[PDB]
């Protein structure tokens, strides 16, 4: 009764660990279908950086979205090397529309001494005058904020919805 | 089951009341042993 | 202990105004 009970307690643990690894394997395969979908959303975001008309109307509001949140007297825009003439129209469009919503005045410049890395797909990072506070408004950061808040929506639409709710 | 209020002089009053009952056993353990010693030799007699 | 540490936190604030 000690040989039969210690074998059957380990025979149950042998089967229970088999279905434990089966539950994690379908869960890990489901995570890969979200990873490459997030990877596909990153490659399709770089094609918006490719054409210039749709990217500058995005980057018009993308710098203004960072300017509205800092609300500093002097702010410093930090962009990539390739997009520096493209943010120069995005900054100058944003000065007379910042002063319509708010009622202060800005000293916006563009950081030339240190650019963003070339691995960035696009976007802009905007600092303050003391370079302490920072707004990361790049397209790599907007995809991280949106696609983590929309995980209830990309689970129910892209996989099956749950049968037990409310 | 507690008795009175903690006041830092009740701690030294109750340590003396504990001292009275700690020596109340050892004074009455031997009295009950002196009675038991005579009880065990009268039974032999 | 709590009443004396409450006062030593209040006496420090009044000594930070008169600087």
């Amino acid at each position: 009764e000690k040989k039969e009970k210690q074998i059957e307690q380990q025979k149950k643990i042998q089967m229970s660990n088999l279905m434990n690894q089966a539950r994690l394997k379908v869960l890990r395969a489901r995570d890969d279908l979200i990873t490459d979908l997030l990877n596909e959303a990153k490659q399709r975001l770089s094609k918006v950086v490719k054409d210039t008309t749709r990217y500058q109307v995005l980057l018009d509001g993308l710098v203004l979205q960072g300017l509205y949140q800092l609300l500093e007297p002097r702010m410093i825009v930090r962009c990539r090397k390739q997009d520096f003439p493209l943010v120069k129209a995005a900054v100058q469009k944003a000065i007379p529309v910042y002063k319509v919503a708010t009622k202060r005045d800005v000293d916006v410049q563009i950081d030339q001494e240190a650019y963003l890395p070339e691995e960035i797909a696009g976007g802009v990072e905007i600092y303050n005058g003391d370079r302490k506070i920072k707004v990361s408004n790049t397209l790599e950061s907007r995809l991280d904020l949106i696609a983590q808040q929309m995980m209830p929506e990309v689970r129910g639409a892209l996989f099956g919805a749950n049968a037990n709710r409310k | 089951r507690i008795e009175i209020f903690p006041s830092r002089m009740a701690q030294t009053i109750m340590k003396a009341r504990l001292k009275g009952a700690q020596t109340g056993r050892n004074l009455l353990k031997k009295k009950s042993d002196a009675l038991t010693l005579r009880f065990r030799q009268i039974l032999k007699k | 202990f709590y009443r004396l540490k409450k006062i030593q936190e209040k006496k420090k604030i009044l000594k930070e105004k008169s600087d």
Binding site: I7, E8, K11, Q14, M15, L18, M19, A22, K25, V26, A29, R30, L33, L37, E40, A41, R44, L45, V48, R54, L58, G61, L62, L64, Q65, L67, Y68, Q69, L71, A101, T102, L139, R142, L143, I146, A147, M150, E153, V154, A157, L158, F159, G160 | - | -
Partner: protein, 55 residues
């Protein structure tokens, strides 16, 4: 008998039930993928610059 029959319980689950669950959701991912990416990248490109409600 318990050691030989436990191997027959392995292949009834580790390649029958598990492997049909991956391709069961690999097909459902491929059917609904392009509707999601049009909804996802619509929100990345619809920048609405607001100020804080406390101005």
């Amino acid at each position: 008998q318990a050691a030989m029959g436990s191997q027959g319980n392995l292949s009834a689950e580790v390649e029958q039930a598990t492997r049909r669950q991956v391709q069961g959701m690999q097909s459902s991912q491929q059917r609904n993928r392009e509707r999601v990416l049009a909804q996802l990248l619509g929100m990345v490109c619809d920048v609405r610059p607001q100020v804080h409600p406390n101005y």
